[PDB]
Write a protein that binds this ligand. Structure first.
Ligand code: ATP
Ligand code: ATP
Ligand code: MG
Ligand code: MG
Lengths: 29, 564, 550
C-alpha cells in the first residue's frame, strides 16, 4: 500500500546519484 | 533564439529520439514499481526475490538498448554537422579566405563542431533522464498531498530567475575563448608549414614566443571561467537547500494546526528530498546550455552566411569556340575598393592565335588571369566567353574548358598520377596521362623514379625541384585539352632544354588550331612569334601590335627590349 | 608501461602543487560534511513521526541547514580549483609540445603532415589534461567512502563482512579484456581524426587552385568519406562500453542475491535482528555500487593515458642533428670549401644526389653554379646553410666545419634567398626585419632602397606597416621577391647565396641589381639558368647529374 520501503528508497537514491558517474563524469569534478 | 537554432539539427532523427524516450519512460516505470509488488522486505521468500531479480534484469536490458540507440543516432548527427559545415565553408567567395586565415578556418571546422556535438550529446540525455525521474516523483508527491505540491510548484520559477540573468555572460566568455584558440592554431600552422625558412633565419624562439602570447590570453580567460563555475555551484546548492527547508517548515505548521496527519508528511518529505535533487540537476544543466550556445556562434555564422559571388549557371554547350572578348573592363580588389588595378581593358582572344601580355612588375597581369578564370568579378564593363558572360556556364564545365598554369604553381600531397589527373570526373586512362606528361616534358624524369607514376609527393611538393613542379603543373593543365589556355610565367624555372617543349607546344604543335592562348611572361624572347603583343602598364594598355610594329614604333616595348 | 607515462605526467604537474593541495583540502572537508546530513535528516523525520516539541524540531533544522551550507561551499571551492588546474595543465602541455616540435630535423617534417601535427596539438592534449584533476579526484572520493562503509559494516556482523569479500561485484578477467580493447580503439580513433583533419588542411590551404580546377565537390566527398571511418570507430567504442556495463550490472545483481540468501540464513538461526539486517543490506548495496564505480574509474584513467602515447613520443624524439656548436668569432673572412661532398636525402637514401663535389668560394668574387633541372643546385645551397649534413666529405667555413658555429651566429653571416620565396603574415617591416631582435627603421629603409622596394612600398595603405597577408598572397610575385632580397640585404652577410633570386623580376629591374659585390667584401654564390647573368661571374661551375664538369 501507501507505505515506503527504506531499502527500495535508498536504491532509488543511489540510482539517482550514480547516473552522473558512468555518464558525464565532467559534472562531478 | 539561438537555442532553437541549436535544437533544429535534431529534426532529421525525431523517430529514433521518440523511441529512446519511450524506452527511458518504460525503464523508469519498471524500476519504480518494485516496492508495490514486494512489500517492506521485513514482511519476508523465494517469489518476492525472483520477482525483483526478473525486474532488475529487464530494466538493465532496456537501459542497454536505449543507450545503444541514442549513441548510434548521435554519431550520425555529429558527422552530418561536420560535413555540412565544411561544405558551407567551401562555398564562400574568394576574398573570404583572404579575410580568414587557414588556421582559423581549420580550427572552426574541426574543433568547434566536435565540442558542440559532445556537449549536446551529454546534456540532452542527462536532461531527458532526470526530467523523466522528476515527473515520476512528482506524481507520487502530488498523490501524497496536493496543497504542499502546489506551494512547492509555485516557488520553482524564482530559482530559475537568477541563472537567466547571467546567461549572456557565459556566451560572451566562450566566444573569446574559441577566438583565442583559433588564433593560437593559426600561428602553429603557419610556423610548421615553413620550417626551412624558420631554420634558415634561426627564428624558433620568435615562433615560440608568438605561441606563448596566445596561451597567456587563454590563461587569462580560464580564471574567470573557474570563478564563475564555483559561484554557480554555490548558488545552485543554496537554492536546493532553501527549497527543502521552506516546505519542511510549512509541514510543521500544518501538523501543529491539526489539519494533516504526520503519516502523509513523512512520505511527502521523503519524496521531496529526491524531487529537489532532480530539479537541482536541471538547474545545473542550464549554464552548460548557454556555454554551448556561445561555442556555436561562428560555425552557424558560416552556415547562414550568403556568398557574395554569383551562383553557377546552366549552359553546357557541346561545342565551344574559345573566343574571349574584354569590353572596357575595370577592377579593384575588395579590400582596397578605391584603387583601380585595371582600367578600361579592351582586346580579344581568338582560336589559333597566341596573344602575349607583357609589362613591368605589379602592372596587373595576374589580375587579368584571375579575372579570366572567374575567381573575381569585374567592377565595370563586361567579359564574354563565346558571346556569353562567364557565370552563365556550369561551374565544372567552365573550368574544364579553361585551364591555367598559375604563377609559382602548387602541387597537392598525392600520387603524380592523381596530381596530373586532378579535378577530372571521368578518370583518364594511363595512355592519356603518359601522352600529357610527354607533351610537357615531365616524362623524362617521372619514368626514372622507382615507382613511376605511383610515386607519392609531400603536401607542399617538396620532393620535386622547381622545374619539375612547373612541368607537372603544365601536364596537369594539358590533360584536359582546354579551349583557352593560360600560361602565367610557366617558363620561369624551366631550363633551356625544357623551354623548347613549350615553344613546340605554342607555335608548332598541330593541336594549336583548337585553342586560344594567353601568354604572360617576363622572358621577352619567347613572345617574338606572338600574333599580338599587348603592353600593360599602370592597369592600362599603352600599345599593341606585332613584334615588328612595336619595334618600329620605338615605344615602351622597344625601350624595354633594348636595355640590355 | 602506462605507469611510466603516469609518472611523467606527475613530474609535469609540479608547478600546480600549491593549488592541488588546497583542492585536496576542500575535497576532504566536503567528504566529511556530506556524511552528516542523513543523520540529521533521520533525527528530523522521526520528530515529525513522534511528538512534535517545536524547539527540538527547530534546533535540528538549524543544524541541518548549517551543515548543508558548509558542504556546498566546500564542493564549490573544490570544483573551481580542479577546473583551473586542468586548464593550466593543458596549456603547459601545448607549450612544451610546440617547443619540442620546433627542434626536429627537416626530415621529420616530410614524414608527417602539418594537419596531423596540428590535430595532435589540439584535441589530443585534452585527454592528457583530464588525468589528474578529473579521474583521481573521483577515485579518491569513492575510495575514502568505501572504506567508511566497510568500517560501518564491520560493527554489525563481522562474519557477513568477511563473506562480503566473495569475488567482489566484479571479475578481474573481464576488466583486463575491456581495458585491452578500449585503449586500442581510442588510439585508432585519434589516428582517424588526424587523417580527417589533414584533408581540411589541404583543401583550405590551396583553395585558389581548387577553384581554378573546380574540384570543391571532390574535396567535400573526400572529407565525408574520411568522417565515415571516425563515425564507425565511435560506434564500435560505444557499443562495447554499453555491453560491458550491462555485464557488470548482472554481476552486481547476482552478488546481491547471494548476500541476501546468507543474511536470510543468519536470520533463520537467530544470529541477527531485523534492524541490523536492514542496515547491513543498505550498506551492502552502497558498497557493491561504489566498488564497481572505483574499478571503472581506474580503468578509464589508465586507458586514456595509454592511448595518448603519441604526444609523449613526439615530445621525447631526439633530433637527427649533430651536437650544437660553440664558435662565434669576432671576424670572419668568408672562405668556403667543399671537399669530396656526397649527399643523399634521408627519406630516400638509396638514390645519391651529389657524387663527390669539390670547389672553393673566396671573398670579393662572384661564383656561378649552373645546370639543368634536378641536378642538385638547391641541394648544394641547403648543404651550405647547414640544413642537411653531408653523407661524405666535409664542408668548411674558414677552415672550421660548418656545424661547429653557433646556430644564431651562423645564420647571421650566411644568408640566402630561397627559390620561390615565402613570406609570413604581418607587416612589411616584420618581414624585412625577420629574425632580428632589434632593428632600426633607418636600416629597414636602406635595405628597402637597396633592393628597389621603396617605389612600391610608398603606394601601400600604411607604407612599411601594411599587412602582406598569409604567405604574402596580397603582393605581386616581383614585389614578394624584392622583399625577400631586402630581408637578406638588411643583415649585411659575409656570405650571400642567390638561389635564382631574379626569376620573377622584370628586365629593367634585373639590370639594376647585378652589382652584388660592389664593395668587394662579400662572398657571393649565384645560382641561375639564364646565361645572361653569369657573364658577370669570375668563376663558373657547371653541375650535371650531380658531378662537376670540366
Ligand atoms: N589579393 C590582393 N588584394 C589587394 N591587392 C592585391 C592583391 N593581389 C595583388 N594586389 C595588388 O594589385 C596589383 C596587381 O598585381 P599583380 O599580381 O596582378 O601583378 P603582376 O603583373 O602579375 O606581377 P608580376 O610580374 O610581379 O608577377 C599589385 O599592385 C598588387 O600589389
Ligand atoms: N626533399 C627531397 N627528398 C628527396 N629527393 C629530393 C628532395 N628535394 C629534392 N629532391 C631530388 O633531388 C634532386 C635535386 O633537386 P634540386 O632541388 O636540388 O634541383 P635544382 O638544381 O635546384 O633544380 P631546379 O633548376 O629545377 O630548381 C632531384 O632529383 C629532386 O627530385
Ligand atoms: Mg604575376
Ligand atoms: Mg632549385
Amino acid at each position: 500500500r501507501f507505505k515506503i520501503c527504506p531499502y527500495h528508497w535508498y536504491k532509488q537514491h543511489m540510482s539517482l546519484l550514480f547516473r552522473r558517474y558512468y555518464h558525464k563524469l565532467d559534472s562531478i569534478i | 533564439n539561438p537555442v532553437r537554432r541549436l535544437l533544429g539539427c535534431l529534426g532529421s532523427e525525431t523517430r529514433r529520439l521518440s523511441l529512446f524516450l519511450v524506452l527511458v519512460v518504460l525503464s523508469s516505470l519498471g524500476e519504480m514499481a518494485i516496492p508495490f509488488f514486494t512489500g517492506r522486505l521485513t514482511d519476508w521468500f523465494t517469489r518476492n526475490l525472483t520477482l525483483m531479480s526478473i525486474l532488475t534484469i529487464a530494466s538493465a536490458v532496456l537501459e542497454f538498448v536505449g543507450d545503444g540507440i541514442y549513441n548510434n543516432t548521435m554519431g550520425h548527427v555529429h558527422s552530418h554537422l561536420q560535413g555540412e559545415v565544411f561544405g558551407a565553408v567551401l562555398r564562400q567567395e574568394t576574398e573570404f579566405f583572404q579575410q580568414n586565415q587557414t588556421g582559423n578556418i581549420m580550427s572552426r571546422v574541426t574543433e568547434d563542431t566536435s565540442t558542440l556535438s559532445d556537449s549536446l550529446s551529454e546534456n540532452l540525455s542527462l536532461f531527458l533522464w532526470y526530467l523523466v525521474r522528476g515527473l515520476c516523483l512528482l506524481g507520487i508527491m502530488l498523490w501524497g498531498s496536493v496543497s504542499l505540491t502546489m506551494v512547492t510548484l509555485i516557488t520553482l520559477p524564482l530559482l530559475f530567475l537568477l541563472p537567466k540573468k547571467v546567461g549572456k555572460w557565459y556566451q560572451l566568455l566562450e566566444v573569446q575563448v574559441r577566438e583565442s584558440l583559433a588564433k593560437s592554431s593559426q600561428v602553429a600552422i603557419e610556423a610548421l608549414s615553413a620550417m626551412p625558412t624558420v631554420r634558415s633565419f634561426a627564428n624558433e624562439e620568435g615562433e615560440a614566443q608568438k605561441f606563448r602570447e596566445k596561451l597567456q590570453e587563454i590563461k587569462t580567460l580560464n580564471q574567470k571561467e573557474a570563478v564563475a563555475y564555483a559561484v554557480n555551484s554555490w548558488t545552485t546548492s543554496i537554492s536546493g537547500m532553501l527549497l527543502k527547508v521552506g516546505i519542511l517548515y510549512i509541514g510543521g505548521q500544518l501538523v501543529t494546526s491539526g489539519a494533516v496527519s504526520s503519516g502523509n508528511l513523512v512520505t511527502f518529505v521523503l519524496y521531496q528530498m529526491q524531487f529537489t535533487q532532480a530539479v537541482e540537476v536541471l538547474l545545473s544543466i542550464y549554464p552548460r546550455v548557454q556555454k554551448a550556445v556561445g561555442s556555436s556562434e561562428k560555425i552557424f555564422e558560416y552556415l547562414d552566411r550568403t556568398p557574395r559571388c554569383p551562383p553557377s549557371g546552366l549552359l553546357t554547350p557541346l561545342h565551344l569556340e574559345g573566343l574571349v572578348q574584354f569590353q572596357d573592363v575595370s577592377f579593384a580588389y575588395p579590400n582596397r575598393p578605391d584603387v583601380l588595378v585595371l582600367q578600361g581593358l579592351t582586346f580579344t582572344l581568338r582560336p589559333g592565335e597566341v596573344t602575349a601580355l607583357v609589362g613591368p612588375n605589379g602592372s596587373g597581369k595576374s589580375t587579368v588571369a584571375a579575372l579570366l578564370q572567374n575567381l573575381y568579378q569585374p567592377t565595370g564593363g563586361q567579359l564574354l566567353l563565346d558571346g556569353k558572360p562567364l557565370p552563365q556556364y556550369e561551374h565544372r564545365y567552365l573550368h574544364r574548358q579553361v585551364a591555367a598554369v598559375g604563377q609559382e604553381p602548387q602541387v597537392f600531397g598525392r600520387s603524380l598520377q592523381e596530381n596530373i589527373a586532378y579535378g577530372l570526373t571521368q578518370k583518364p586512362t594511363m595512355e592519356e596521362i603518359t601522352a600529357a606528361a610527354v607533351k610537357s616534358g615531365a616524362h623524362s624524369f617521372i619514368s626514372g623514379l622507382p615507382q613511376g607514376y605511383d610515386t607519392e609527393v609531400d603536401e607542399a611538393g617538396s620532393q620535386l625541384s622547381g622545374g619539375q613542379r612547373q612541368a607537372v603543373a603544365l601536364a596537369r593543365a594539358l590533360i584536359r585539352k582546354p579551349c583557352v589556355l593560360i600560361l602565367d610565367d610557366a617558363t620561369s624555372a624551366l631550363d633551356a632544354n625544357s623551354q623548347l617543349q613549350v615553344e613546340q607546344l605554342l607555335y608548332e604543335s598541330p593541336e594549336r588550331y583548337s585553342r586560344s592562348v594567353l601568354l604572360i611572361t617576363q622572358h621577352l624572347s619567347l613572345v617574338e612569334q606572338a600574333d599580338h603583343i599587348l603592353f600593360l602598364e599602370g592597369g592600362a594598355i599603352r600599345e599593341g601590335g606585332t613584334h615588328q610594329q612595336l619595334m618600329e614604333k620605338k615605344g615602351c616595348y622597344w625601350a624595354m627590349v633594348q636595355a640590355p | 608501461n602506462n605507469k611510466v607515462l603516469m609518472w611523467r605526467l606527475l613530474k609535469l604537474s609540479r608547478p600546480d602543487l600549491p593549488l592541488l593541495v588546497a583542492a585536496f583540502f576542500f575535497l576532504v572537508l566536503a567528504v566529511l560534511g556530506e556524511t552528516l546530513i542523513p543523520h540529521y535528516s533521520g533525527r528530523v523525520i522521526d520528530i515529525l513521526g513522534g511528538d512534535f516539541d517545536p524547539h527540538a524540531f527547530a534546533s535540528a533544522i538549524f543544524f541541518m541547514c548549517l551543515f548543508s551550507f558548509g558542504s556546498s561551499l566546500s564542493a564549490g571551492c573544490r570544483g573551481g580549483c580542479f577546473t583551473y588546474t586542468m586548464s593550466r595543465i593543458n596549456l603547459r602541455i601545448r607549450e612544451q609540445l610546440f617547443s619540442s616540435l620546433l627542434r626536429q630535423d627537416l626530415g621529420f617534417f616530410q614524414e608527417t603532415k602539418t594537419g596531423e601535427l596540428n590535430s595532435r596539438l589540439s584535441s589530443d592534449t585534452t585527454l592528457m589534461s583530464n588525468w589528474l584533476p578529473l579521474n583521481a579526484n573521483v577515485l579518491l572520493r569513492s575510495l575514502v567512502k568505501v572504506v567508511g562503509l566497510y568500517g560501518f559494516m564491520l560493527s554489525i556482523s563481522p562474519r557477513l563482512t568477511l563473506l562480503s569479500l566473495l569475488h567482489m561485484p566484479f571479475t578481474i578477467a573481464a576488466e583486463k579484456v575491456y581495458n585491452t580493447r578500449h585503449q586500442e580503439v581510442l588510439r585508432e580513433i585519434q589516428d582517424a581524426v588526424a587523417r580527417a583533419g589533414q584533408v581540411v588542411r589541404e583543401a583550405v590551404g590551396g583553395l585558389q587552385t581548387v577553384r581554378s580546377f573546380g574540384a570543391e565537390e571532390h574535396e567535400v566527398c573526400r572529407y565525408k568519406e574520411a568522417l565515415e571511418q571516425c563515425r564507425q570507430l565511435y560506434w564500435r567504442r560505444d557499443l562495447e562500453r554499453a555491453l560491458y556495463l550491462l555485464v557488470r550490472r548482472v554481476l552486481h545483481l547476482g552478488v546481491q542475491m547471494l548476500m541476501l540468501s546468507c543474511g536470510l540464513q543468519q536470520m533463520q538461526d537467530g544470529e541477527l535482528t531485523q534492524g541490523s539486517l536492514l542496515s547491513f543490506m543498505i550498506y551492502q548495496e552502497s558498497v557493491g555500487s561504489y566498488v564497481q564505480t572505483l574499478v571503472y574509474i581506474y580503468g578509464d584513467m589508465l586507458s586514456n593515458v595509454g592511448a595518448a602515447e603519441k604526444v609523449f613520443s613526439y615530445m621525447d624524439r631526439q633530433p637527427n642533428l649533430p651536437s650544437p656548436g660553440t664558435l662565434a668569432p669576432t671576424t670572419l673572412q668568408g672562405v668556403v670549401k667543399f671537399q669530396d661532398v656526397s649527399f643523399a636525402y634521408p627519406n630516400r637514401p638509396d638514390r645519391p644526389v651529389l657524387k663527390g663535389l669539390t670547389f672553393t668560394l673566396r671573398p670579393g668574387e662572384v661564383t656561378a653554379l649552373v645546370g639543368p633541372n634536378g641536378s642538385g643546385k638547391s641541394t648544394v645551397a641547403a648543404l651550405l646553410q647547414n640544413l642537411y649534413q653531408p653523407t661524405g666529405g666535409q664542408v668548411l667555413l674558414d677552415e672550421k666545419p660548418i656545424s661547429q658555429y653557433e646556430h644564431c651566429y651562423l645564420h647571421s653571416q650566411v644568408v640566402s634567398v630561397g627559390q620561390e620565396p615565402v613570406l609570413f603574415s604581418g607587416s612589411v617591416r616584420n618581414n624585412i626585419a625577420y629574425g632580428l631582435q632589434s632593428c632600426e627603421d633607418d636600416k629597414v629603409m636602406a635595405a628597402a632602397q637597396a633592393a628597389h622596394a621603396d617605389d612600391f612600398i610608398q603606394e601601400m595603405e600604411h607604407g612599411i606597416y601594411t599587412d602582406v597577408g598569409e604567405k604574402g598572397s596580397q603582393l605581386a610575385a616581383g614585389q614578394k621577391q624584392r622583399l625577400a632580397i631586402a630581408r637578406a640585404l638588411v643583415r649585411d652577410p659575409r656570405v650571400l647565396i642567390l638561389d635564382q633570386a631574379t626569376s620573377a623580376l622584370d628586365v629593367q629591374c634585373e639590370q639594376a641589381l647585378q652589382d652584388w659585390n660592389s664593395r668587394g667584401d662579400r662572398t657571393v654564390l649565384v645560382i641561375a639558368h639564364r646565361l645572361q647573368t653569369v657573364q658577370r661571374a669570375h668563376q663558373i661551375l657547371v653541375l650535371q647529374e650531380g658531378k662537376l664538369q670540366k
